[PDB]
Design a protein around this ligand. Structure first.
Ligand SMILES: CC(=O)O[C@H]1C(=O)[C@@]2(C)[C@H]([C@H](OC(=O)c3ccccc3)[C@]3(O)C[C@H](OC(=O)[C@H](O)[C@@H](NC(=O)c4ccccc4)c4ccccc4)C(C)=C1C3(C)C)[C@]1(OC(C)=O)CO[C@@H]1C[C@@H]2O
Ligand SMILES: Nc1nc2c(ncn2[C@@H]2O[C@H](COP(=O)(O)OP(=O)(O)OP(=O)(O)O)[C@@H](O)[C@H]2O)c(=O)[nH]1
Ligand SMILES: Nc1nc2c(ncn2[C@@H]2O[C@H](COP(=O)(O)OP(=O)(O)O)[C@@H](O)[C@H]2O)c(=O)[nH]1
Ligand SMILES: [Mg+2]
Lengths: 88, 433, 451
């Protein structure tokens, strides 16, 4: 269980980093039309982002949907989900 | 009790390992026969890091020797410390790789990897708390590179939560002994970058420069180079074996040094280094050690730090010394050479202090840098690689062993990606858009 | 057990074998009778190195060599010579006539009814070996037996063993001097077999060895014995990496891995640096740099070709004696800055280095001085093409009129075979002319976002 949780959290953190990096340069160009080289999007720090390299980058579209339970008992869940949705 | 398993593959690995077992068996007082004849009581306190105990109050190292050619093993057995090792750990075959990476990885090494893993598993299961592994090998060779990478992959598959160090001797611009060094180095770096926690960068030209210019040896031989290497390997793990004012395990070094998973290629160095007759003219103090550690001529990787920026550095001091001097010296080095240190890390100098120095010295220090200049090394190999791959200079020797041409492309792309991150953190600002 | 099996075909092969085995017996302390007093005096050792000699129970040492020839004379010379009791009595010599400078006679007509015996004895020797490395075949182009029977034997060996290396040492016809009128036909005929079935062929020319003997050793009247001794020294330097300890050992597989870029280019030149007389051995340092430089000089090449007219594709240096790595590195760096020596752009590294502690020995009655250091160089280049081209011209000048052709067809060949062989040779030259050409250009480009 600990191994699974650690690997899942590592993959999610890398996905957050690659998504955030991808959006920024995006906005940047779309407005700056400049070509600040090609920056460097960390695709190789995980298999998940590595296999989805063609879909995440290049001429593409992306949208992450997040579900937030409604109870008062799952507060510790819900806030964390928002903190992950605050990325990108 | 933290305990590390030592593996050594190939000619270079075996020679460096033999010299290393003589340096570690003279700090922990061990007779070549295997008995203890030391003086201090702290030598036996942490002997289990490297040695198993044998019935007659003897000590046998955890070394595991691998080679696809038997001859090197003989040169180890007929030596000053040949009888120290266990006979069962001499795992070897015949019909060596012949400087073919494919033979080491796919054809020949695949037959002997099962025996090597059997020995490794037997050695590891007896350990109270395994800290990690060490591997000494050469990237530019045959059995060394291929078998080392294969063993690293298998071990990381079996033991994911353990440290895997690696002391690799890579090719060099001018001193080259094989014509197919680029292919072997490329395909080895393709494997090391994925399945290793720490990698140490050594090349023979830097060691020759140290021997010629610092130690002033007229006719250096491989023994002296292995001597310097052994000195740094002993320096890295000093805190597992001895007490001190501020300890530093291997995992502490890994945590503090690497900022991201793929940047774990380090530049090692040792201080002090003097040339016999000059010894009386230099006072041994912490400022002198700090001055020699950060000098570009002392590095062991032939990568000038002044062409890049230090992501991180670590300094492991040995000896009775004042913590104020260490702190002020590291702060001064950071402040004066502000251009050579990255700006988004507030303080990028790890410091550790161990009380007991080497035998015949009063103070010593080991330096582990992580800098962007290492990119140059890989870039050089990449150039040579493409210079041979555009025409397929020696490619049939590799594809005749069950390989495909795509794997070379994967390795080249992976090395080029790795160079990217370094080149990036290498600039000294990013303001314009 | 780095075992090798030596093959000697023809008069030239047998004489080079005599020189080689004299050197080997001197190296290992083996007396011509077959016994080794060194182990008896000491009490035991590894001096019975398995590379060449098999040790029986009684203490005798029999060589791992096989002699073949169609003339009884050349081998009745050794059956009654100094080394009569060294070799196994089974010497595989057909009590019949000879191939008579005829490839067809040696390959088709008389080469049969002996080949089965040779392969049976090769099988027996191979079964006695553990970890056999390869074969060392000695023969001579231009001769009937040495060409035709060697082609047949190489074909059968490639069929039977397959994966084992087969290194060939052979005598190429010289540009000017020759000992037979029908040398080009035989050489062009055996090239079609040596191109396919061998793994690495070393070529030597007698005019070159004569010039080296005249210039360096101050011998005005050399015979074949001196040439055979030099060739024996070269082969010993090649093989010494798997008999004695050293700082960097080079096996027979590293050879082929480092000197053969493509399968059809395995024709390297060979040179030996410290060829010097006893009188001239003084007044000279014989350092590592001196011998390394002497290896590259055109005058010291063992084949009449100029390396300056081509490009170096690969080089392998094998050092013997009191040599340390730093001098080898310095010599290589010094060479790499010379403009007269050109390397192909697709081989940035260029050099293979091996070091051995055993120094070279001195043959009593020889002509080479005792020296502390030596180096044997093996260099795959493109200049070798010239050595073929001259021969082709000669072949044309004989084949336009079908001279001496009826002898070949009378022994079971047809005319078309000649043409086929010639075409094969042409293709080989073309490959050389294609491999030394520089790369096209950058051949690809990238833009740094010009917007
Ligand atoms: C009279 C005196 O001061 O002796 C010194 C000495 O002269 C110097 C020159 C030593 C000496 O080192 C060398 O000359 C040398 C040559 C080639 C390669 C490496 C070293 C020394 O050999 C090295 C030797 O080191 C040790 O004794 C340590 O225990 C050392 N162990 C070994 O070198 C060793 C080697 C083989 C077998 C057993 C032990 C060590 C160093 C680091 C980490 C662990 C162990 C020492 C103090 C000295 C001599 C003997 C001259 C120096 O080396 C080291 C590593 O300390 C050179 O720079 C230092 C400065 C020392 O002053
Ligand atoms: N270097 C060297 N070359 C030799 C020697 N003996 C003969 N040759 C060369 O061999 C060539 C003749 O071919 P041979 O090797 O004698 O052929 P063969 O063994 O006699 O076989 P047959 O022609 O059938 O009798 C000559 O041109 C010589 O130059 C020798 O002892 N040393
Ligand atoms: N430091 C050191 N390096 C060596 C030694 N022997 C060989 N090397 C280096 O390793 C390379 C040859 O690799 P090799 O040892 O043959 O690999 P192996 O065949 O797998 O054992 C050369 O480029 C040398 O620079 C040695 O004894 N010490
Ligand atoms: Mg004859």
């Amino acid at each position: 269980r600990l191994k699974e949780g650690a690997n899942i959290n590592k993959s999610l953190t890398t996905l957050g980093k690659v998504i955030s990096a991808l959006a920024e340069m995006d906005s940047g160009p779309n407005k700056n039309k400049k070509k600040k080289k090609t920056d460097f999007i960390p695709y190789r720090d995980s298999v998940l982002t590595w296999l989805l390299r063609e879909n995440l980058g290049g001429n593409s579209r992306t949208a992450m949907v997040a579900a937030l339970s409604p109870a008062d008992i799952n507060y510790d869940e819900t806030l964390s989900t928002l903190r992950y949705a605050d990325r990108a | 009790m933290r305990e590390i398993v030592h593996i050594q593959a190939g000619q270079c690995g075996n020679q460096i390992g033999a010299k290393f077992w003589e340096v570690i068996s003279d700090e922990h007082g061990i007779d070549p026969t295997g008995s203890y004849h030391g003086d201090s009581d702290l030598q036996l306190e942490r002997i289990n890091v490297y040695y198993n105990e044998a019935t007659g109050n003897k000590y046998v190292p955890r070394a595991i020797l691998v080679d696809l050619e038997p001859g090197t093993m003989d040169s180890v057995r007929s030596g000053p410390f040949g009888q120290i090792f266990r006979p069962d750990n001499f795992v070897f075959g015949q019909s060596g790789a012949g400087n073919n990476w494919a033979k080491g990885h796919y054809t020949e090494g695949a037959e002997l990897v099962d025996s090597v893993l059997d020995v490794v598993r037997k050695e590891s299961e007896s350990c109270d708390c395994l800290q990690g592994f060490q591997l000494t090998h050469s990237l530019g060779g045959g059995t060394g590179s291929g078998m080392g990478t294969l063993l690293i992959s298998k071990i990381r598959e079996e033991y994911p939560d353990r440290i895997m160090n690696t002391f690799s001797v890579m090719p060099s611009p001018k001193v080259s002994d094989t014509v197919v060094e680029p292919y072997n180095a490329t395909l080895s770096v393709h494997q090391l970058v994925e399945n290793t926690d720490e990698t140490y960068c050594i090349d023979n030209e830097a060691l020759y420069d140290i021997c010629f210019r610092t130690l002033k040896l007229t006719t250096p031989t491989y023994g002296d180079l292995n001597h310097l290497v052994s000195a740094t390997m002993s320096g890295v793990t000093t805190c597992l074996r001895f007490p001190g004012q501020l300890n530093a395990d291997l995992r502490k070094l890994a945590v503090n040094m690497v900022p991201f998973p793929r940047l774990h290629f380090f530049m090692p160095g040792f201080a002090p280094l003097t040339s016999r007759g000059s010894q009386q003219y230099r006072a041994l103090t912490v400022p002198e050690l700090t001055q020699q550690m950060f000098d570009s001529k002392n590095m062991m990787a032939a990568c000038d730090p002044r062409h890049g920026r230090y992501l991180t550095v670590a300094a492991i001091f040995r000896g009775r010394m004042s913590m104020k001097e260490v702190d002020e010296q590291m702060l001064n080095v950071q402040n004066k050479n502000s251009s050579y240190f990255v700006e988004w890390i507030p303080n990028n100098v790890k410091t550790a202090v161990c009380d007991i120095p080497p035998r015949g010295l009063k103070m010593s220090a080991t330096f582990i840098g992580n800098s962007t200049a290492i990119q140059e090394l890989f870039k050089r190999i990449s150039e040579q690689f493409t210079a041979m791959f555009r025409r397929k200079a020696f490619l049939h020797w590799y594809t005749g062993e069950g390989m495909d041409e795509m794997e070379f492309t994967e390795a080249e792309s992976n090395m080029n990606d790795l160079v990217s991150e370094y080149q990036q953190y290498q600039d000294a600002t990013a303001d314009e858009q | 057990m780095r075992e090798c099996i030596s093959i000697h075909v023809g008069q030239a092969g047998v004489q080079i074998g005599n020189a080689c085995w004299e050197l080997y017996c001197l190296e290992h302390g083996i007396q011509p009778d077959g016994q080794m007093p060194s182990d008896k005096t000491i009490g035991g050792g590894d001096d019975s190195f398995n590379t060449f000699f098999s040790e029986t129970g009684a203490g005798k040492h029999v060589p791992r060599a096989v002699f073949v020839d169609l003339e009884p004379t050349v081998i009745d010379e050794v059956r009654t010579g100094t080394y009569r009791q060294l070799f196994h009595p089974e010497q595989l010599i057909t009590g019949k006539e000879d191939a008579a400078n005829n490839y067809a006679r040696g390959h088709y007509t008389i080469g049969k009814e002996i080949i089965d015996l040779v392969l049976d004895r090769i099988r027996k020797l191979a079964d006695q070996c553990t970890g056999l490395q390869g074969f060392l075949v000695f023969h001579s182009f231009g001769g009937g037996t040495g060409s035709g029977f060697t082609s047949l034997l190489m074909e059968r060996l490639s069929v039977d063993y397959g994966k084992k290396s087969k290194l060939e040492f052979s005598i190429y016809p010289a540009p000017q001097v020759s000992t037979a009128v029908v040398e080009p036909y035989n050489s062009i005929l055996t090239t079609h077999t040596t191109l396919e079935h061998s793994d690495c062929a070393f070529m030597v020319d007698n005019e070159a060895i004569y010039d080296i003997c005249r210039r360096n050793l101050d011998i005005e009247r050399p015979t074949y014995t001196n040439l055979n001794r030099l060739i024996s020294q070269i082969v010993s330097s090649i093989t010494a990496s798997l008999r004695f300890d050293g700082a960097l050992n080079v096996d027979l597989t590293e050879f082929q891995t480092n000197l053969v870029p493509y399968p059809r280019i395995h024709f390297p030149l060979a040179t030996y640096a410290p060829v010097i007389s006893a009188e001239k051995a003084y007044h000279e340092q014989l350092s590592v740099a001196e011998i390394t430089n002497a290896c590259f000089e055109p005058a010291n090449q063992m084949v009449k070709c100029d390396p300056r007219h081509g490009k170096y594709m690969a080089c392998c240096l094998l050092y013997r004696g009191d040599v340390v790595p730093k001098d080898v590195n310095a010599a290589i760096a010094t060479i790499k800055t010379k403009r007269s020596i050109q390397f192909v752009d697709w081989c940035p590294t260029g050099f293979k280095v091996g070091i051995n502690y055993q120094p070279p020995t001195v043959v009593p009655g020889g002509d080479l001085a005792k020296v502390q250091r030596a180096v044997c160089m093996l260099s795959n280049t493109t200049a070798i093409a010239e050595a073929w081209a001259r021969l082709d011209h000669k072949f044309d000048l004989m084949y336009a009129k079908r001279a001496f052709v009826h002898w070949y067809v009378g022994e079971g060949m047809e005319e078309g075979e000649f043409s086929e062989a010639r075409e094969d040779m042409a293709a080989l030259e073309k490959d050389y002319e294609e491999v030394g050409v520089d790369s096209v250009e950058g051949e690809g480009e990238e833009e740094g976002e010009e917007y």
